Scaffold this active site. Structure first.
Site, PDB file in Angstrom:
ATOM      1  N   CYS A   1      -7.038  -4.874 -11.451  1.00  0.00           N
ATOM      2  CA  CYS A   1      -6.831  -3.450 -11.235  1.00  0.00           C
ATOM      3  C   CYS A   1      -8.112  -2.611 -11.161  1.00  0.00           C
ATOM      4  O   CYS A   1      -8.913  -2.569 -12.100  1.00  0.00           O
ATOM      5  CB  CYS A   1      -5.917  -2.894 -12.333  1.00  0.00           C
ATOM      6  SG  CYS A   1      -5.502  -1.151 -12.160  1.00  0.00           S
TER       7      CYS A   1
ATOM      8  N   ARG B   1      -8.435   1.175 -13.513  1.00  0.00           N
ATOM      9  CA  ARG B   1      -8.483   1.205 -14.956  1.00  0.00           C
ATOM     10  C   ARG B   1      -9.227   2.354 -15.661  1.00  0.00           C
ATOM     11  O   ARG B   1      -9.127   2.478 -16.872  1.00  0.00           O
ATOM     12  CB  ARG B   1      -8.971  -0.150 -15.478  1.00  0.00           C
ATOM     13  CG  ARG B   1      -7.909  -1.238 -15.325  1.00  0.00           C
ATOM     14  CD  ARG B   1      -8.384  -2.581 -15.810  1.00  0.00           C
ATOM     15  NE  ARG B   1      -9.323  -3.199 -14.883  1.00  0.00           N
ATOM     16  CZ  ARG B   1     -10.084  -4.239 -15.198  1.00  0.00           C
ATOM     17  NH1 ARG B   1     -10.007  -4.754 -16.415  1.00  0.00           N
ATOM     18  NH2 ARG B   1     -10.903  -4.776 -14.298  1.00  0.00           N
TER      19      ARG B   1
ATOM     20  N   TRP C   1      -0.533   5.505  -9.086  1.00  0.00           N
ATOM     21  CA  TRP C   1      -0.524   6.103  -7.777  1.00  0.00           C
ATOM     22  C   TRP C   1      -1.318   5.163  -6.881  1.00  0.00           C
ATOM     23  O   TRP C   1      -2.235   4.472  -7.321  1.00  0.00           O
ATOM     24  CB  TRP C   1      -1.104   7.525  -7.798  1.00  0.00           C
ATOM     25  CG  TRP C   1      -2.464   7.647  -8.393  1.00  0.00           C
ATOM     26  CD1 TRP C   1      -3.654   7.311  -7.807  1.00  0.00           C
ATOM     27  CD2 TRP C   1      -2.785   8.137  -9.702  1.00  0.00           C
ATOM     28  NE1 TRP C   1      -4.694   7.566  -8.670  1.00  0.00           N
ATOM     29  CE2 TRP C   1      -4.191   8.072  -9.841  1.00  0.00           C
ATOM     30  CE3 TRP C   1      -2.020   8.625 -10.771  1.00  0.00           C
ATOM     31  CZ2 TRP C   1      -4.850   8.478 -11.010  1.00  0.00           C
ATOM     32  CZ3 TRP C   1      -2.678   9.031 -11.938  1.00  0.00           C
ATOM     33  CH2 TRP C   1      -4.078   8.953 -12.044  1.00  0.00           C
TER      34      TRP C   1
ATOM     35  N   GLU D   1      -4.004   0.083   0.118  1.00  0.00           N
ATOM     36  CA  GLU D   1      -2.848  -0.748  -0.130  1.00  0.00           C
ATOM     37  C   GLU D   1      -1.782  -0.522   0.938  1.00  0.00           C
ATOM     38  O   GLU D   1      -1.159  -1.465   1.414  1.00  0.00           O
ATOM     39  CB  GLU D   1      -2.264  -0.461  -1.507  1.00  0.00           C
ATOM     40  CG  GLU D   1      -3.271  -0.613  -2.631  1.00  0.00           C
ATOM     41  CD  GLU D   1      -2.618  -0.514  -4.002  1.00  0.00           C
ATOM     42  OE1 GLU D   1      -1.949  -1.490  -4.415  1.00  0.00           O
ATOM     43  OE2 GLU D   1      -2.757   0.545  -4.658  1.00  0.00           O
TER      44      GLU D   1
HETATM   45  C1  HEC Z   1      -3.675   5.237 -11.932  1.00  0.00           C
HETATM   46  C2  HEC Z   1      -3.467   4.629 -10.536  1.00  0.00           C
HETATM   47  C3  HEC Z   1      -3.746   3.106 -10.205  1.00  0.00           C
HETATM   48  C4  HEC Z   1      -4.433   2.614  -9.105  1.00  0.00           C
HETATM   49  C5  HEC Z   1      -5.116   3.417  -7.900  1.00  0.00           C
HETATM   50  C6  HEC Z   1      -4.376   1.220  -9.215  1.00  0.00           C
HETATM   51  N1  HEC Z   1      -3.707   0.777 -10.368  1.00  0.00           N
HETATM   52 FE1  HEC Z   1      -3.315  -1.067 -10.986  1.00  0.00          FE
HETATM   53  N2  HEC Z   1      -2.823  -3.002 -11.547  1.00  0.00           N
HETATM   54  C7  HEC Z   1      -2.182  -3.451 -12.673  1.00  0.00           C
HETATM   55  C8  HEC Z   1      -2.090  -4.925 -12.723  1.00  0.00           C
HETATM   56  C9  HEC Z   1      -1.459  -5.877 -13.818  1.00  0.00           C
HETATM   57  C10 HEC Z   1      -2.660  -5.322 -11.568  1.00  0.00           C
HETATM   58  C11 HEC Z   1      -2.855  -6.759 -11.083  1.00  0.00           C
HETATM   59  C12 HEC Z   1      -1.653  -7.243 -10.313  1.00  0.00           C
HETATM   60  C13 HEC Z   1      -1.576  -8.773 -10.257  1.00  0.00           C
HETATM   61  O1  HEC Z   1      -2.476  -9.520 -10.858  1.00  0.00           O
HETATM   62  O2  HEC Z   1      -0.646  -9.252  -9.616  1.00  0.00           O
HETATM   63  C14 HEC Z   1      -3.070  -4.134 -10.832  1.00  0.00           C
HETATM   64  C15 HEC Z   1      -3.653  -4.127  -9.506  1.00  0.00           C
HETATM   65  C16 HEC Z   1      -4.074  -3.033  -8.722  1.00  0.00           C
HETATM   66  C17 HEC Z   1      -4.637  -3.100  -7.324  1.00  0.00           C
HETATM   67  C18 HEC Z   1      -4.868  -4.354  -6.475  1.00  0.00           C
HETATM   68  C19 HEC Z   1      -3.779  -4.692  -5.472  1.00  0.00           C
HETATM   69  C20 HEC Z   1      -4.155  -5.804  -4.491  1.00  0.00           C
HETATM   70  O3  HEC Z   1      -3.278  -6.643  -4.154  1.00  0.00           O
HETATM   71  O4  HEC Z   1      -5.316  -5.859  -4.069  1.00  0.00           O
HETATM   72  C21 HEC Z   1      -4.941  -1.808  -6.949  1.00  0.00           C
HETATM   73  C22 HEC Z   1      -5.578  -1.310  -5.559  1.00  0.00           C
HETATM   74  C23 HEC Z   1      -4.571  -0.982  -8.102  1.00  0.00           C
HETATM   75  N3  HEC Z   1      -4.026  -1.743  -9.163  1.00  0.00           N
HETATM   76  C24 HEC Z   1      -4.744   0.388  -8.161  1.00  0.00           C
HETATM   77  C25 HEC Z   1      -1.649  -2.577 -13.645  1.00  0.00           C
HETATM   78  C26 HEC Z   1      -1.665  -1.152 -13.576  1.00  0.00           C
HETATM   79  C27 HEC Z   1      -0.997  -0.267 -14.543  1.00  0.00           C
HETATM   80  C28 HEC Z   1      -0.207  -0.768 -15.785  1.00  0.00           C
HETATM   81  C29 HEC Z   1       0.141   0.077 -17.048  1.00  0.00           C
HETATM   82  C30 HEC Z   1      -1.207   1.018 -14.086  1.00  0.00           C
HETATM   83  C31 HEC Z   1      -0.680   2.409 -14.681  1.00  0.00           C
HETATM   84  C32 HEC Z   1      -2.057   0.864 -12.874  1.00  0.00           C
HETATM   85  N4  HEC Z   1      -2.297  -0.416 -12.572  1.00  0.00           N
HETATM   86  C33 HEC Z   1      -2.521   1.952 -12.133  1.00  0.00           C
HETATM   87  C34 HEC Z   1      -3.293   1.929 -10.971  1.00  0.00           C
HETATM   88  C1  LIG Z   2       1.318 -10.438  -7.299  1.00  0.00           C
HETATM   89  C2  LIG Z   2       1.853  -9.517  -6.277  1.00  0.00           C
HETATM   90  O1  LIG Z   2       1.214  -8.211  -6.336  1.00  0.00           O
HETATM   91  C3  LIG Z   2       1.547  -7.226  -5.528  1.00  0.00           C
HETATM   92  O2  LIG Z   2       2.443  -7.297  -4.598  1.00  0.00           O
HETATM   93  N1  LIG Z   2       0.894  -6.084  -5.729  1.00  0.00           N
HETATM   94  C4  LIG Z   2      -0.190  -5.873  -6.785  1.00  0.00           C
HETATM   95  C5  LIG Z   2       0.094  -4.722  -7.715  1.00  0.00           C
HETATM   96  C6  LIG Z   2       0.800  -3.523  -7.063  1.00  0.00           C
HETATM   97  N2  LIG Z   2      -0.073  -2.414  -6.621  1.00  0.00           N
HETATM   98  C7  LIG Z   2      -0.222  -1.262  -7.360  1.00  0.00           C
HETATM   99  C8  LIG Z   2       0.398  -0.951  -8.684  1.00  0.00           C
HETATM  100  C9  LIG Z   2       0.163   0.286  -9.325  1.00  0.00           C
HETATM  101  C10 LIG Z   2       0.864   0.492 -10.639  1.00  0.00           C
HETATM  102  C11 LIG Z   2      -0.656   1.294  -8.751  1.00  0.00           C
HETATM  103  C12 LIG Z   2      -1.291   1.026  -7.426  1.00  0.00           C
HETATM  104  N3  LIG Z   2      -1.042  -0.257  -6.797  1.00  0.00           N
HETATM  105  C13 LIG Z   2       1.830  -3.817  -5.852  1.00  0.00           C
HETATM  106  C14 LIG Z   2       1.156  -4.838  -4.897  1.00  0.00           C
END
Ligand code: HEC
Ligand SMILES: CCOC(=O)N1CCC(Nc2cc(C)ccn2)CC1
Ligand code: HEC
Ligand SMILES: CCOC(=O)N1CCC(Nc2cc(C)ccn2)CC1
Ligand SMILES: CCOC(=O)N1CCC(Nc2cc(C)ccn2)CC1
Ligand SMILES: CCOC(=O)N1CCC(Nc2cc(C)ccn2)CC1
Ligand SMILES: [Zn+2]
Lengths: 409, 403
Positions: free
Chosen positions: A112, A115, A284, A289
């Site tokens: 992510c 963070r 968000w 993405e």
């Molecule tokens: C505040 C806005 C926010 C943004 C912008 C954000 N995240 Fe994440 N995010 C994750 C996790 C877990 C992953 C890794 C997903 C995986 O390993 O499949 C991730 C992955 C991502 C990815 C990578 C997707 C890809 O396939 O390349 C992006 C871009 C991202 N987050 C953006 C838990 C969170 C949580 C949980 C409380 C929140 C809130 C969160 N994320 C909030 C956000």
């Molecule tokens: C392992 C499969 O992972 C996924 O399909 N994704 C990775 C995680 C998810 N993206 C996100 C999630 C959040 C909470 C904010 C912005 N982007 C949706 C796409």
């Protein structure tokens, strides 16, 4: 010199050492003989000797964060977690403890890039939920709160944990909002190709389709030891953003769109050895993405050609960078549209910059930050981003968000 | 159907859903930096009898390649005795060099590995002799615009005396002149090497693209300056297919990418000076060399000229500008008839290479972060391909700067 990983930033010249990785209690897939860092998944699919180990670790982690490590409260809580576990084989987390673990989980997520916000998380306790109809009510409350009419707020809803001798609570959908993927007669796919399987399961469980390219799917909510149940999301709760380009009038005519709320719902939230099989979280979107993966991946909406074609680009040769020119305009359209609709969204330049800030912060707070380079670097304009030039160390920390085998099969 | 578990790693392609297993990593004899505790795959450099064995493995490998293993010769061939070291036969060197390239994990251009012209210069004893060899290497490889892959191997290392070294990171690089105010005229990346050239008696330039002289070093001696014959260095003036003013930027780039600071390791022997060349992938020039903040850093300038809104990131001026710069490069090289491959073709060909190598050796070591190009990552097929990384010998590796 230091007996810890040395990470260098090739742009600034600066160096740091990672001590945080020493606390890792979970092994990865790499080995001195070969790096499998690129693999999406490690490779697979509740006792006391080991559960207790994870619980205390978590408990120490918690008392340390409230700067009361080694205090009376701390000692008593430990004794307490051993008491519950010995007489029942499991145990319960306090509210405040749950809020800490959830935030630590996001904090610990290596993939992510968002963070920097790990501290601003709205935790909704739903460990009291006892039925699918209840799961659905919590879920809508989650969406209403998180969407907040465009000014999105990061939130997670934690449902009941697993307990031996009983089925878990589960959300079959990978996200709370997914567009249908309809297999066509000609072998093509109408909608999002990624959701063909979940789309089929919904129809089986009594859902009536619709040949649209963006039809929001129903939810398959499963309460313990019971067949899933279908629930249709009330349209007014699902905020969407029709897509249009800032200067290319025809773009809007493509009839494209996307939803505002990215809410992952199939992962497992692990805290202190406890497993919350259903804990949907949302934040968000980062424009790339939607504008690069969801819309440009060959196996997704695959629109590059459609768009390069309106642009009157030479799609007959790679050296005309038509794919690159098209993808940029598509990404721009996504950003222009959300900003136009007043729906929160962050571009890959801003996100990555703020992620670098997050690294410095984490260096002073924990002496390191687990990060997965290939996921931190955006799908487009990689090196034009500051994180590209940042070496990262990847390891597994708990609390964590993890992959879990799909309910069906 | 597929091993499960860690022994033979399963590799998946997310675009096609296809899966394969890698059995080649079992031939790895060198540990990398990763541990089951934490993966350090993203680091650029290593934190940092045995010979007799490394050199039988190579000989076997070589004999197995010519479909003549376990015979008399191979056997007979398997000096270390009364010297502690040994020398390779020329045919063996050619095979080893081709293999080093084949095993390079960070090279997306490996579809071409079988097509490498190997120059044996193990018979040099002077900086002068190195120069003449290098000059002939440049000429051959440039082949008037129709570039050819080439490597020239100099004398191996001898435990006891100094190493033959080429101080430059590349046979062709542009000078970088610092000039009070704190800015660089030329290539910021080459300030050190430029200064060292002056220190060693080179008359500086005053341009943004002055080709640098070579600092060549024979064992235990001070390096010697040599100026590349201008007629040898083929360059390419940059211009854009539609943005007429682009050529006014006065930018240009040389046609031949020749790496010269690496160490070639074959059967235990180490060749500290072995310059190798191929042809460029447009994005190295257009994205790294030209857009990078610490290189020619033209990104903003070009955006303003294009009249983009550089006030906010959200306008994506960096993205648009980068694409146009990349196009300019591809357009200029094609217009000048000089070989070059865009990231789309190169990665498409690398995917083919992976299929081949799978049928040939049951795998291919690959560094994802380097295989995927610096821009438009996911619009390339390799982005969605999982990769296994490990070290194989022969191999190319880093070595410390001679100063
Ligand atoms: C505040 C806005 C926010 C943004 C912008 C954000 N995240 Fe994440 N995010 C994750 C996790 C877990 C992953 C890794 C997903 C995986 O390993 O499949 C991730 C992955 C991502 C990815 C990578 C997707 C890809 O396939 O390349 C992006 C871009 C991202 N987050 C953006 C838990 C969170 C949580 C949980 C409380 C929140 C809130 C969160 N994320 C909030 C956000
Ligand atoms: C392992 C499969 O992972 C996924 O399909 N994704 C990775 C995680 C998810 N993206 C996100 C999630 C959040 C909470 C904010 C912005 N982007 C949706 C796409
Ligand atoms: C036929 C044209 C050709 C193309 C196109 C090609 N290579 Fe490579 N290439 C390498 C090595 C070694 C590396 C890894 C460099 C490192 O780890 O520092 C590399 C790396 C690369 C990179 C990654 C650069 C980066 O920093 O992202 C690209 C792109 C590349 N090669 C393209 C040895 C070679 C050799 C040597 C016999 C030849 C010929 C060669 N390469 C020919 C080619
Ligand atoms: C387990 C299901 O996994 C998936 O659907 N995916 C897994 C991988 C996903 N994203 C990626 C992949 C990489 C390598 C970098 C950034 N993002 C594309 C879709
Ligand atoms: C570790 C740093 O490596 C580098 O800076 N470089 C090594 C890789 C180099 N590119 C190359 C090399 C060849 C031989 C062909 C095309 N492109 C660019 C310079
Ligand atoms: C040790 C010398 O290092 C360098 O000159 N550099 C360090 C890194 C180099 N290339 C890179 C880096 C990455 C992360 C991916 C592909 N290519 C470009 C500059
Ligand atoms: Zn690794």
């Amino acid at each position: 010199g230091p007996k810890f990983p040395r990470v260098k930033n090739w742009e600034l010249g600066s160096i740091t050492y990672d001590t945080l990785c020493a606390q890792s209690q979970q092994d990865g897939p790499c080995t001195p003989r070969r790096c499998l860092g690129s693999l999406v998944l490690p490779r697979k699919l509740p006792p006391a000797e080991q559960l207790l180990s994870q619980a205390r670790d978590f408990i120490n982690q918690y008392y340390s964060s409230i700067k009361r490590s080694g205090s009376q409260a701390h000692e008593e809580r430990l004794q307490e977690v051993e008491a519950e576990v010995a007489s029942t084989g499991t145990y319960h987390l306090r509210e405040s403890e749950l809020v800490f673990g959830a935030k630590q989980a996001w904090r610990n997520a290596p993939r992510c890039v968002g963070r920097i916000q790990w501290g601003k998380l709205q935790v909704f306790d739903a460990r009291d939920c006892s039925s699918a109809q209840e799961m659905f009510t919590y879920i809508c409350n989650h969406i209403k709160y998180a969407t907040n009419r465009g000014n999105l707020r990061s939130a997670i809803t934690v449902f009941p944990q697993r307990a031996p001798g009983r089925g878990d609570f589960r959300i079959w959908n990978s996200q709370l909002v997914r567009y249908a993927g309809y297999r066509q007669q000609d072998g093509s796919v109408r909608g999002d190709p990624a959701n063909v399987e979940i789309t089929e399961l919904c129809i089986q469980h009594g859902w009536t389709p619709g040949n649209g390219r963006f039809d929001v799917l129903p939810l398959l909510l499963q309460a313990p030891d019971e067949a899933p149940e279908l629930f249709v999301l009330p349209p007014e709760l699902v905020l969407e953003v029709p897509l249009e380009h800032p200067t290319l009038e025809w773009f809007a005519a493509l009839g494209l769109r996307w939803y505002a709320l990215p809410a992952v719902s199939n992962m497992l939230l692990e805290i202190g050895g406890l497993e919350f099989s259903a804990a949907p979280f949302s934040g968000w979107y980062m424009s790339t993405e939607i504008g690069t993966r969801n819309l440009c991946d060959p196996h997704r909406y695959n629109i590059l050609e459609d768009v390069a074609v309106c642009m009157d680009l030479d799609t007959r040769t790679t050296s005309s960078l038509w794919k690159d020119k098209a993808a940029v305009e598509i990404n721009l359209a996504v950003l222009h549209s959300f900003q136009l609709a007043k729906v929160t969204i962050v571009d890959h330049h801003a996100a990555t910059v703020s992620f670098m800030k997050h690294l410095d912060n984490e260096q002073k707070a924990r002496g390191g930050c687990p990060a997965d380079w290939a996921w931190i670097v955006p799908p487009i304009s990689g090196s034009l981003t500051p994180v590209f030039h940042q070496e990262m160390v990847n390891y597994i920390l708990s609390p964590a968000f993890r992959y879990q085998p799909d309910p069906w099969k």
